[PDB]
Amino acid sequence: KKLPITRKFYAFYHAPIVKFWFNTLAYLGFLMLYTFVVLVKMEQLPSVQEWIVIAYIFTYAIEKVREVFMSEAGKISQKIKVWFSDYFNVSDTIAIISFFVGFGLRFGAKWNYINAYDNHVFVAGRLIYCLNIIFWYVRLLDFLAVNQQAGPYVMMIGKMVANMFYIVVI
Amino acid sequence: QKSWIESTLTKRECVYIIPSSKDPHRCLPGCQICQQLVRCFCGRLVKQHACFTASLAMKYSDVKLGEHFNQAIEEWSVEKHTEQSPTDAYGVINFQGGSHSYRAKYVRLSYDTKPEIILQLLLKEWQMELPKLVISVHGGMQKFELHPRIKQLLGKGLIKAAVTTGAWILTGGVNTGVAKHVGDALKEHASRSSRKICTIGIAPWGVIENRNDLVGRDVVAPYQTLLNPLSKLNVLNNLHSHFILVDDGTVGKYGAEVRLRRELEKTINQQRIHARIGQGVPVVALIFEGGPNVILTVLEYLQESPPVPVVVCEGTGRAADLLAYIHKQTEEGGNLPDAAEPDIISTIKKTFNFGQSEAVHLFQTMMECMKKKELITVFHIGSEDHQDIDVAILTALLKGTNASAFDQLILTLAWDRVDIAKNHVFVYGQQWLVGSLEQAMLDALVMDRVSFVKLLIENGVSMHKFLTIPRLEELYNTKQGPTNPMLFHLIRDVKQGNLPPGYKITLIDIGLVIEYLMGGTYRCTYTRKRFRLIYNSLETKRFPYPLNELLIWACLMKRQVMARFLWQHGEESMAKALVACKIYRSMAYEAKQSDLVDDTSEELKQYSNDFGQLAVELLEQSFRQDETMAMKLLTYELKNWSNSTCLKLAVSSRLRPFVAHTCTQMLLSDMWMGRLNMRKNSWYKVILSILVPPAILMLEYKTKAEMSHIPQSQDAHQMTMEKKLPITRKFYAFYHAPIVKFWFNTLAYLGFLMLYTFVVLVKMEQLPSVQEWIVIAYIFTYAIEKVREVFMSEAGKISQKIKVWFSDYFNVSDTIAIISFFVGFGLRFGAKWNYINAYDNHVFVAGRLIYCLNIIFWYVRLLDFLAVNQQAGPYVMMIGKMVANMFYIVVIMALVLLSFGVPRKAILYPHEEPSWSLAKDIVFHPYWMIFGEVYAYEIDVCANDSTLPTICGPGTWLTPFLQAVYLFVQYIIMVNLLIAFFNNVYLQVKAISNIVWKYQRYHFIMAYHEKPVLPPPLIILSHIVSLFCCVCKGPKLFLTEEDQKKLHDFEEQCVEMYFDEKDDKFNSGSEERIRVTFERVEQMSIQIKEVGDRVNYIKRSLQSLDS
Amino acid sequence: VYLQVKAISNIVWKYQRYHFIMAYHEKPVLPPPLIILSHIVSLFCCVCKGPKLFLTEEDQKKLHDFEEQCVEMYFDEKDDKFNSGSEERIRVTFERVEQMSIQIKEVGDRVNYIKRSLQSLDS
Ligand SMILES: CCCCCCCC/C=C/CCCCCCCC(=O)O[C@@H](COC(=O)CCCCCCCCCCCCCCC)COP(=O)([O-])OCC[N+](C)(C)C
Ligand SMILES: CCCCCCCC/C=C/CCCCCCCC(=O)O[C@@H](COC(=O)CCCCCCCCCCCCCCC)COP(=O)([O-])OCC[N+](C)(C)C
Ligand SMILES: CCCCCCCC/C=C/CCCCCCCC(=O)O[C@@H](COC(=O)CCCCCCCCCCCCCCC)COP(=O)([O-])OCC[N+](C)(C)C
Ligand SMILES: CCCCCCCC/C=C\CCCCCCCC(=O)O[C@@H](COC(=O)CCCCCCCCCCCCCCC)COP(=O)([O-])OCC[N+](C)(C)C
Ligand SMILES: CCCCCCCC/C=C\CCCCCCCC(=O)O[C@@H](COC(=O)CCCCCCCCCCCCCCC)COP(=O)([O-])OCC[N+](C)(C)C
Ligand SMILES: CCCCCCCC/C=C\CCCCCCCC(=O)O[C@@H](COC(=O)CCCCCCCCCCCCCCC)COP(=O)([O-])OCC[N+](C)(C)C
Ligand SMILES: CCCCCCCC/C=C\CCCCCCCC(=O)O[C@@H](COC(=O)CCCCCCCCCCCCCCC)COP(=O)([O-])OCC[N+](C)(C)C
Ligand SMILES: CCCCCCCC/C=C\CCCCCCCC(=O)O[C@@H](COC(=O)CCCCCCCCCCCCCCC)COP(=O)([O-])OCC[N+](C)(C)C
Ligand SMILES: CCCCCCCC/C=C\CCCCCCCC(=O)O[C@@H](COC(=O)CCCCCCCCCCCCCCC)COP(=O)([O-])OCC[N+](C)(C)C
Ligand SMILES: CCCCCCCC/C=C\CCCCCCCC(=O)O[C@@H](COC(=O)CCCCCCCCCCCCCCC)COP(=O)([O-])OCC[N+](C)(C)C
Ligand SMILES: CCCCCCCC/C=C\CCCCCCCC(=O)O[C@@H](COC(=O)CCCCCCCCCCCCCCC)COP(=O)([O-])OCC[N+](C)(C)C
Ligand SMILES: Oc1ccc2c3c1O[C@H]1c4oc5ccccc5c4C[C@@]4(O)[C@@H](C2)N(CC2CC2)CC[C@]314
Ligand SMILES: Oc1ccc2c3c1O[C@H]1c4oc5ccccc5c4C[C@@]4(O)[C@@H](C2)N(CC2CC2)CC[C@]314
């Protein structure tokens, strides 16, 4: 029993297994809040739950920018071509961009003060939230794919969609 | 200085320069030519010494002014005027890659190295193993060219002597003469056996080329093998591993190592060959094509204590062949044959020109080498004489140097060579001492020498007289063999942690390990009263069954090859295999629950499955011979294994293929019948006879002779010892049959559900109805019986009874069902009634609703009753295995569910306060869509035929698109993925479920021998009697003594038939017949070509006799 | 199509654990609501100022000996499996029985050259 006290904290928080659950628990708490935001009535100013959501997706987007620039290959345009080759990285790009399109229409709109959803710009911003949240539930399969048993089925669903295309066309 | 070589080893330089004899060559101006060409008497010339002290003396003219008083010219000895100095050389001498990389080492040491220092060099520093044989090859330098035929035999024989004994081969090192032919033997038959072969070349630092390239402290130097045309010097041989290099003067001066190599042989022969054998390492001398100095070396070996023997070859043709010819024309140790000395000395001088003067001096050496014939082994090639020189090398260490046959046998034991021991130690006429063969057995068991245990048993050693208590104390307490590092962890677990540092293990301690591994109520023969008292006293000091005692030993010491051998010898073969399956299995479970750097649990688990497979294959062999006698083998007490049972041992091991084998299933099917002959009855008749007790007496039963293979109770046996079976016996036979106890509980259980379904569907008043009290009386008395199953089951530890019982599915489900019933009955019964309207009391509602939910437990429990059938049972066990296997597909289906419900609720209902109804609404409708409900008129809420016209609003046109995607993913992808999952996993889950069903009929059927006759509404009558007879005051298979004798003869006969048909199936396979053809056609190709050469030796006389 | 897509999906899943696990050696400790604390530090230490397997010199030597030994064992067991197969043993039998048929017929002719001298030396 070696490893004094301040060494055992470095060992824990830098283990990849710990970084995973420490991102997973934060992601599940994110969806619980972002499910609350989208089911409950939205007022003019965002709620405290809704700012936490925005703070997540914003800071989550910065980390995706960092993964691109600081990955492997010296050529900057070669960093791009590798990263847009994965499924959920393309899905994150659509999810991050469409959120701030939706937050922009939501937040930067002239309110009515007599009845909500007479502003069609605010409706369109809210309805993008309701559709953007699908990206973030399907992303739980991305978290579920760490398991030895679940993982191969998640990768299987995509391969079966491609293989049955022409039966579905018929 | 970070160099063990520098503190111990020695270079040495000729610091004092004496010139050559008299003459500088040419070139009149004498003042320059004394430096240009005149050598030192060292041997090298004056410009290469460099002499840090005498470098200041070479400027005058040289060291040591002139004529120097001619007696003093010779004065250079290597002791006086040749100064020692540190290392200058060690490293890898890696040869330039030919076939492979071929590394080696070198030292460059002195001549005056002490014999203890050179021995310290080879072992510790160079990480070499202490050998078991030294083959010092000796011959003549530079001669050459064996024949091709003789090159294969002498090549193959030298390798198989060294790789099968782990030998050192001492050569000359340099590529001239012998080492060229030693290494070419290594070229042909290497098979990377340099791990076992360590050829050590002892050369000088003289005639070797590129000596200055090897200069360096810890230098991996490259070394070339190119035949230098202009040169005549010698290179090292590439296929050596270690080099010892001795310098007396310098380049030239071709001898300094003859003493040091010989003194190395003295040091090895003084070392013990093994830490159990007092005999020293033998040294042999192999003689190829020789020379004049060879004859002085051969004679120096024979004239010594100990007399090192000599092996001489022939066919090469030199002094080697002289020793072949001189030894041939000579009987036992007398002087000479008829006077043919002019024929001998003439043959001596054709090798080297001596000329009748000192060729006579060779003859006094040839008459002392014909003298000691017993230590000389000639290998005649051309008549397969003595079969492959590796036999003849190792046989030569046994013929001479007269010693005991014990000394001959234990020498072969260290070499791990039985074919020498069988064919040259166990020959006819050899006389043995009284306790020598026993000491050989004790050595062979410890050293893990299985094939010598086989040889000593065949040649007279009895294990009954051999294996004593103190000797078997030793077999556990050895580190001089392959030991188990796990046995010491098992001993401290049963002695509460005390561990003294010496700690000779006792057999009282081993028995506590066996009882811990076998588990349950196992009691070894070491921890009983009879053994402890005779263990204090120290024939009765021997064992009655020794091979039961060693088979446990071999398993606990993790010696599998020894365990498979000791299993085949002795009685009770199928039982010992099931014990060993249990012993390794328990050690495999202890290995995982222990902090070791070496797990070795997968090795033990494989060893457990090997003996388990042997048990199944003996049951299959016994079942084919006689079905009835094989069922007796499953259930007779063993009397040497704690009165246990081959079923009880296999069920303890969870060895499923034995319990699921058709022999045990016939036995379980026959214990189910009891004394009913259900081959000529029907299940209609058993049920009818439960309801009509006088219909019992119209049922065909089984006789005493039709039940000799079925275990019974003690008092049930008394009923059989006496159309037999009078009236009051036929009632005992019926109501105690397990098949009858089943239907008599099943009918009571179905009547229970019919009542408890009535109670829960019909209105409940304040006081319980008569139907409802019967229900309570059932579950109460049913709960008492479950408490009795826990306490009175198997294992003495009360908390271990708990852990086994909560491991089954329906026993956990019964616990929840029994507890939640009385929670519900408590809220139901013990509540203040209202008397104006029922179900205004929320405590009574909650009690009733628990009944409505508790009844699900009792319908699902009908699957527990349905699982007795051969066809339904495996499907019930299959349902559970399929739920576990499809978990992660269903999880994905649940995330797709939430991916749709959350946006649909968000789009369609934009004006919601926080409520727990939101959790309901995002799950509810999307779940029912999986099951056929499209909600057709709630799609497109803005349509005219919509049933939700007020939900139409901004953006509700998105939801038909969302639901189209949802159901495509659910039915068309995920439901069909789940159909496909079950199809392609069906066969291997149906198969596993059949074995699991067949395995657990044992615990099922053996439970109904202990259950009472009477069902769980009336069972309280049986629990009064069970307390009455216990305070006031399982089954066995009975056999008479003439049926135990017939059973032991059956067990022995079926094992004999097992190994015979196993050997006949192997020897009659196509794989084995092809290779024995391959090996015989190989030998026939050798002979016919060699007979084809003899018949060509015939036609030389045809031309002669035709003349 | 289940078995061959389930099989391909297992290998693809196992392949991409590398890019997955080696990504989490470079990700920050702290999750994406609080990760902005880690991006300040990452810009602080960069402007102001992957993993390796360390081995001592006596462990590199033990590793190179292991690599060499396992390659030697590879070609030996590859040659022993080929020379011990039923296909190769039949043909080496085929080629030797062919040569033995040649020799015995040709030794069978020599022994017929012997019986010419039997009638001679019997006379
Ligand atoms: C590696 C790859 C993955 C990473 C991708 C990361 C990049 C993601 C990129 C995201 C950018 C997406 C576009 C932003 C929105 C513009 C469009 C729009 O509809 O605007 C609207 C809002 O117009 C405004 O002026 C208010 C916007 C407030 C700020 C929020 C948007 C920017 C945040 C971005 C933060 C992202 C940064 C994340 C960190 C880097 C315009 O319409 P309106 O004004 O509402 O209506 C006018 C009429 N009315 C007033 C009568 C109603
Ligand atoms: C091997 C393993 C398997 C075997 C497991 C076997 C053990 C199973 C264990 C079972 C025990 C389970 C708990 C019992 C009920 C207590 C909880 C409860 O809600 O009580 C209620 C009844 O309170 C009473 O005082 C009336 C209870 C009458 C007796 C029935 C319960 C005990 C029977 C147990 C017989 C089991 C023995 C079986 C044979 C051993 C309290 O609430 P209330 O008073 O209704 O309401 C008060 C307010 N009001 C008056 C205004 C309405
Ligand atoms: C073991 C394996 C794990 C299973 C998975 C997890 C299981 C899912 C767990 C879901 C959690 C439960 C949701 C209900 C939440 C509470 C409801 C409540 O408070 O009030 C509601 C009561 O309604 C009910 O109590 C009925 C709830 C709906 C039935 C759910 C069936 C399961 C379908 C899904 C199964 C697959 C799930 C797929 C997963 C994504 C009503 O609201 P109220 O405000 O009380 O009154 C409103 C008045 N009004 C009615 C007159 C209008
Ligand atoms: C980004 C990642 C963060 C990490 C997560 C932890 C940090 C986040 C934690 C807390 C932040 C909460 C916001 C602060 C304000 C509190 C007020 C409040 O919520 O009141 C509500 C109570 O609601 C709750 O108590 C929870 C509501 C969200 C549902 C999910 C809770 C769990 C999420 C996290 C934990 C699960 C973790 C699961 C995995 C282990 C009452 O409703 P209202 O607000 O009066 O009305 C709403 C109307 N409005 C919106 C129009 C105004
Ligand atoms: C504040 C309270 C905190 C706790 C609460 C939260 C609990 C935590 C969060 C979520 C639940 C997870 C708990 C079980 C984890 C088991 C460990 C395991 O084996 O993980 C495996 C999968 O690891 C994953 O992370 C799989 C995905 C789960 C997290 C993301 C949610 C998606 C699935 C659910 C979404 C909803 C489902 C639908 C119903 C609503 C990885 O391991 P393995 O390959 O099996 O091998 C074992 C060895 N190993 C671990 C070293 C790798
Ligand atoms: C108009 C009405 C429509 C009618 C119906 C028809 C339309 C609907 C049809 C199809 C919808 C399904 C979309 C998935 C298809 C992916 C295919 C694919 O290529 O996958 C790739 C990965 O992708 C995955 O592994 C997918 C994992 C996420 C699940 C998809 C979301 C579904 C659940 C949420 C839905 C919730 C529902 C509620 C929300 C609205 C794999 O590709 P590959 O072939 O293996 O290529 C080789 C590997 N390679 C990628 C590395 C090169
Ligand atoms: C625990 C194990 C026992 C073993 C079983 C045998 C012993 C059990 C046998 C008999 C016990 C019956 C109780 C005695 C009182 C009789 C009155 C009666 O029932 O009247 C009813 C007639 O109902 C019937 O005749 C049957 C009602 C139960 C349905 C199942 C019958 C078969 C169960 C057993 C045989 C099937 C065996 C199947 C397998 C071969 C009329 O209704 P009520 O009662 O006027 O109104 C109810 C209202 N209250 C409840 C609010 C008051
Ligand atoms: C190991 C086993 C543990 C068992 C623990 C025992 C649990 C005992 C628990 C509770 C005791 C209940 C007694 C009353 C308590 C105070 C409330 C009260 O008096 O009345 C209230 C009762 O409200 C309810 O909800 C009653 C039902 C609660 C039990 C819920 C099921 C628990 C068992 C799960 C299944 C078993 C699973 C177990 C399987 C393992 C209201 O009624 P009232 O007041 O009479 O008048 C009417 C309303 N009025 C006041 C407005 C007029
Ligand atoms: C008062 C009137 C009394 C009579 C009436 C009551 C009749 C009796 C009660 C019930 C019906 C059973 C009658 C058929 C029995 C056939 C015999 C047989 O082979 O049994 C097998 C299964 O044995 C079982 O017990 C299976 C489960 C049936 C009893 C429990 C009810 C669950 C299934 C139904 C629930 C509802 C279903 C849904 C529809 C509502 C066992 O045998 P085997 O492996 O096939 O091998 C034959 C050799 N052997 C017998 C030596 C082993
Ligand atoms: C919120 C809404 C939920 C949404 C849906 C999802 C939830 C529903 C999901 C699942 C429900 C099904 C439950 C059974 C699962 C058992 C799994 C298992 O491990 O089985 C074990 C035994 O178990 C059996 O053999 C089961 C036999 C009883 C049948 C189960 C009841 C179903 C019928 C009544 C239902 C009637 C319906 C009406 C009543 C309400 C076998 O385990 P194993 O893997 O083989 O392990 C190896 C062997 N070992 C055990 C010895 C170690
Ligand atoms: C894109 C694919 C090809 C399709 C091409 C064709 C379509 C072009 C694409 C999109 C069309 C978007 C506008 C259509 C609405 C017109 C009618 C209307 O007013 O509807 C509603 C508002 O609707 C809105 O305010 C729009 C909301 C924004 C939707 C965000 C993108 C949705 C698609 C996902 C992104 C796309 C990618 C998805 C992946 C495939 C009605 O609200 P209202 O105006 O207040 O009506 C009065 C109501 N009242 C009487 C009750 C008060
Ligand atoms: O092989 C077995 C053959 C027959 C039975 C069992 C066996 O094993 C048991 C087991 O295990 C299961 C696992 C999953 C699903 C069902 C079961 C079952 C069922 C069961 O509970 C059951 C019958 N009886 C009591 C019931 C009164 C008959 C007890 C023994 C039992
Ligand atoms: O083998 C892999 C094992 C585990 C994971 C991946 C693997 O490969 C990836 C990949 O590829 C897929 C293709 C089709 C369907 C699913 C995926 C996935 C999923 C995934 O996105 C995912 C987990 N994490 C991020 C998530 C935080 C965990 C990143 C890496 C990832």
Side-chain angles (χ1 to χ4, degrees), chain B residues 868-883:
Chain B
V868 174
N869 197 355
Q870 292 181 356
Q871 292 84 24
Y875 294 108
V876 177
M877 291 181 182
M878 186 170 180
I879 293 162
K881 291 183 183 292
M882 296 305 291
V883 173

Side-chain angles (χ1 to χ4, degrees), chain A residues 13-14 16 19-20 22-23 26 56 59-60 63 66-67 70 145-148 152-153 155-156 159-160 163, chain C residues 1-2 5-6 8-10 12-13 16 19-21 24-33 35-36 39:
Chain A
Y13 289 105
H14 291 274
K19 294 182 180 180
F20 179 71
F22 190 50
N23 287 319
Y56 183 91
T59 59
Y60 179 78
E63 195 271 329
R66 184 183 63 79
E67 290 182 355
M70 291 75 163
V146 174
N147 197 355
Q148 292 181 356
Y153 294 108
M155 291 181 182
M156 186 170 180
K159 291 183 183 292
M160 296 305 291
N163 289 322
Chain C
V1 78
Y2 182 83
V5 178
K6 180 67 177 176
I8 294 164
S9 297
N10 290 321
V12 174
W13 180 75
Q16 291 178 356
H19 296 287
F20 174 60
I21 294 169
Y24 286 179
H25 182 79
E26 188 174 0
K27 288 190 189 292
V29 174
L30 191 59
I35 197 164
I36 192 70
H39 295 291

Side-chain angles (χ1 to χ4, degrees), chain B residues 645-661:
Chain B
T645 299
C646 292
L647 289 174
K648 292 181 182 179
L649 293 172
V651 175
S652 180
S653 299
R654 292 183 181 176
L655 195 281
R656 290 179 179 88
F658 181 94
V659 182
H661 191 264

